[PDB]
């Protein structure tokens, strides 16, 4: 569409898209190999009840 | 019934009988290989002995 | 609960025009599905469906046992009278 | 204005452009433009597998030919984008004066 | 073993044809390629006794092909592709890498 | 599957080997039928 | 052998086979070449008489 608000027309083009998990087997295992960085450190934070 | 569906329900029972009979005749073609190993492991002592 | 609605693409080619025109609520307790619009509505325009998007029926690989590696280890000779044997021998002179 | 955009703003420029099937993920991806995908309630695919058997000898249960019939549904996850034309821009360059 | 040849077209245009138009909006259902399977369930209707021996249809003459820049590596038996998309379609955007 | 007359056209081939495992424990409608059946007809 | 059943009709199929060890001595050999998994946990359980 088009905005009659100022700043342009700026409206959203949208596309729908459907998919099915295809294959009775397992089909695309993924493997986890490397460590970039721990998001939390091994820290010293005590539990505070 | 001779109507348009009761001609067709005949054909669905034909394809099952065809693909039931295609499997079990192929099973002896697979059962032949399974009959190999359970008499070849009546003989064949291990390599270590 | 309700029958599957009215179908609006049906009776865009009507098979017969009704030969008598009455108020329709005079037989309101007769019908099964009923909708009384006011000169237009929003549900007159939308379409909806669902689709079977193609089957997948695998064919098992019919394995001839000769078309396989293991039938060089074994002789395979047919004998169509094996149900009538009861005893058999190979002599092996060395 | 779109008669120029079909000539200029439709092709004949990249400057940073990717095509999907140019990229080599597309061997994972069946891709099929089904344009009426907004109008569907569900989307079904039937799978049928026909499991073979093997004859078994002696005091054993007997192997029966089994078949398996199954269906799935699609998933939508309606995708969006974001666009911003500017005031004194689209009207000026698409026929509002000049 | 680089520079593979790929298919450029988004594979297929499942559009509502003369069978899938009248089936969708009237009967509230659709079938992918009812043009085909509407003919195959009637072709084996006159003469039957099975076959089965088919994927119930496929033939049209070609896919289109275009050679593209790519990387193919050889792992095991398979010719497996290899890709990394942080430079192609993820550079300087705000989408996190998946 | 849920519809039988559409399965008389294969619309592609199946290439897997999966039993009553994962693929069967993922489906909306699965029917594991022995070779004799009545509801097929 | 169409014998009968309930809920259908069972055809069974027998195929008689006969095989003989055919060389003089040790015509096949096997070899354990790996270990897949240990089935039993190794003990720590006493015999209760």
Swiss-Prot record, chain C:
Location of this chain's protein in the cell: Virion; Host nucleus
Entry function: Self-assembles to form an icosahedral capsid with a T=16 symmetry, about 200 nm in diameter, and consisting of 150 hexons and 12 pentons (total of 162 capsomers). Hexons form the edges and faces of the capsid and are each composed of six MCP molecules. In contrast, one penton is found at each of the 12 vertices. Eleven of the pentons are MCP pentamers, while the last vertex is occupied by the portal complex.
Subunit structure: Homomultimer. Makes the hexons and eleven out of twelve pentons. Interacts with triplex proteins 1/TRX1 and 2/TRX2; adjacent capsomers are linked together in groups of three by triplexes, heterotrimeric complexes composed of one molecule of TRX1 and two molecules of TRX2. Interacts with scaffold protein; this interaction allows efficient MCP transport to the host nucleus. Interacts with capsid vertex component 2/CVC2. Interacts with the small capsomere-interacting protein/SCP.
Family that this chain belongs to: Belongs to the herpesviridae major capsid protein family.
Protein name in UniProt: Major capsid protein
Gene for this chain: MCP
Curated annotation (Swiss-Prot), chain F:
Coiled-coil stretches noted in the UniProt entry, renumbered to this chain: none
Highest taxon above the source species: Viruses
Subcellular location: Virion; Host nucleus
Subunit-structure text: Homomultimer. Makes the hexons and eleven out of twelve pentons. Interacts with triplex proteins 1/TRX1 and 2/TRX2; adjacent capsomers are linked together in groups of three by triplexes, heterotrimeric complexes composed of one molecule of TRX1 and two molecules of TRX2. Interacts with scaffold protein; this interaction allows efficient MCP transport to the host nucleus. Interacts with capsid vertex component 2/CVC2. Interacts with the small capsomere-interacting protein/SCP.
Record function comment: Self-assembles to form an icosahedral capsid with a T=16 symmetry, about 200 nm in diameter, and consisting of 150 hexons and 12 pentons (total of 162 capsomers). Hexons form the edges and faces of the capsid and are each composed of six MCP molecules. In contrast, one penton is found at each of the 12 vertices. Eleven of the pentons are MCP pentamers, while the last vertex is occupied by the portal complex.
Family stated for the protein in its record: Belongs to the herpesviridae major capsid protein family.
Protein name as catalogued: Major capsid protein
Species name: Human herpesvirus 2 (strain HG52)
Designated gene of the protein: MCP
Residues of the full protein shown: 10 to 50 of 1374
